[PDB]
Symmetry: C10
Subunit: 75 residues, 10 copies
């Protein structure tokens, strides 16, 4: 158990690293949203739900990382 | 088997790291969509399905990462 | 018990790495805010609440990393 | 054999990391496609096959990583 | 004791890596500030507080890393 | 034998990491091709061979990584 | 004590990695300064102190890494 | 002798990582070439020999990584 | 001492990784200088010393990395 | 000797990683050179030696990495 439990804990730490992509990704989507709206205010009702979709899809990949982390931590 | 289970769990942690690319990638596809539509609203119906295709192809690489991760956790 | 504990400490160091994403992320949101406002100052009240949401959502991923880190530390 | 097998699983995890290049890359190709089409809608039939070519070639790099991964998992 | 101590020291070093995100992030914010002031000098007093805020928030994430690094060290 | 074999397998996995550079690089080349053709469609036949060359050369580096990975495997 | 000391030196090496954020960051600030001054030479006296501020604050992050490094090397 | 050899194989896998730099690097040179030529087609004969030098110098760093890799493999 | 010398040598290897930032940083300062002068040749004498300052501050972070590396190899 | 020699060899592999920064950096300088010359052909005699300086300074950081690698490999 001891070496295996230790591996799970190290593993759970390693598995959060990929969350960096969601962190950068979410920001990239919101940067585009802010730049697009500032170039063309009239487009905001159109581009805002693309921003919400984009952020959610990007966050999803981070959530897959987190899921593996929790399965290691608690499973 | 202690060493092998340990290695399976470390390895599953490690195979989520690659998801950072789909995280960044999906975001890049949505940012282009946002900037594209704001420059030229009339193009929206043309470029939106391209965004869907882009996101899905970028996501697939992260899903491969996760597939290995699940194979190491359960296979 | 010592091996497990050693692994809890390493794992905790490792789970902060992901916070780099929020570091760059928050910055990217605020950079667009500054550039957007400078190109079009009248858009400020519109894009400021968007920057707050952007930063919050980006920070949240970093906060997930830190949650794992603290779960491992205690 | 336990150390060797251990190494094989650690190795398989490691060899998905390079898939992040394809996750980001495929996205860069789709972003250019979206941006090019929004700048110049008439160019769409020309630039779309280039996007398919760019994506398949970017994806091939991630597939090489996954192949090495599967060689480690099952061989 | 020696295994645990060892892990605390390695873990402490590992938790400084995430600080690369604030190093890049802070810079991105100040670059946006510079590019925006040079495009539009009259906007200086509006975007400056935005840059302070954005820097503070980027930095905080690097500070959560240092915090974990200090917990492991002390 | 077991230690050496072990290292060959870990080393083989490690040498695929560098392939992320070709994955990004190839894409950068094709994006430049797309942005340049859409700005200037008449340039298509000039820049296309340039993109093939640039892709080939980016890819080669990922292939040197795979080569090391295959040597370690076989 | 040998394992502990070992760990201290491995740790000290590890804690210089984060200095790459300052190496890139300081450069991003100087690049903006150069580009801003070439677009608008009259803005130089305004944007130069902002560049000093941005750089010192970016550098401070690398210095925190180096401090942890020196704590590991000598304490 | 087995431990040393194990380390030669791991070290060799590790030294290919740096080749990612040349992967992205070569691509960045060729992207600028394509964009430069599309903006200004008459500059092609001037910027093509610059792209060749750029790619060569970038590849060379990758070749240094591979040299270490082969020195370790034999 | 076997373990400690081993750790010193691994650690010295690891503390060079941070030099990748000065590598990228210096380049970013020179790229801005190049793009700055080409947009506005008259600015050359103004922005060139800024480039020198930029490069040197970016390089210093890599020199800190190397300092630790030498301390681990010889100190 | 055995564990120490093994550490040096692993260390020498780790120390080439930072060469990735010179590889990207050198390219960034040459990209700027190519973009600057294509915007403004008359500037080429001015910006070319800044490109040579930039690439050399960037390559220098990679050479510091390589130096540590050779000291580990052969020292």
């Amino acid at each position: 158990m001891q070496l295996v439990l230790a591996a799970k804990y190290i593993g759970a730490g390693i598995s959060t690293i990929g969350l960096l992509g969601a962190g950068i990704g979410i920001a990239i989507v919101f940067a585009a949203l802010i730049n697009g709206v500032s170039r063309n205010p009239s487009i905001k009702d159109t581009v805002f739900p693309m921003a919400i979709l984009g952020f959610a899809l990007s966050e999803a990949t981070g959530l897959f990382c987190l899921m593996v982390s929790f399965l290691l931590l608690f499973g």
